[PDB]
Amino acid sequence: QFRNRVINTKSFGGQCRKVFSGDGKDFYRLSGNVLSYTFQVKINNDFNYE
């Protein structure tokens, strides 16, 4: 199970670290700490009918 909030992932550190998500097509502000946050999609489909 995922448990409760441990890291402050919205600590911006005074930076204006915009990222454009091509997926959501919107500008988002990353926290100062996060090493990367990226939006490339992967879609991984198993059908198995018998």
């Binding site: 930076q15 670290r17 100062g32 700490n33 996060v34 090493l35």
Partner: protein, 50 residues
Amino acid sequence: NSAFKQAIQASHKKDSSFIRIHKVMKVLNFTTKAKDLHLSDVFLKALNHL
């Protein structure tokens, strides 16, 4: 007097189909500048704390 009739028919039908597709579409390419690259602030920090 005796009469005998027998008719037997059997059919076995076997079918298999296989398709593998592997498209790789490039839409963009880049070259990074050789010199005076602008390091990621978080990377610049990580280096400064070494």
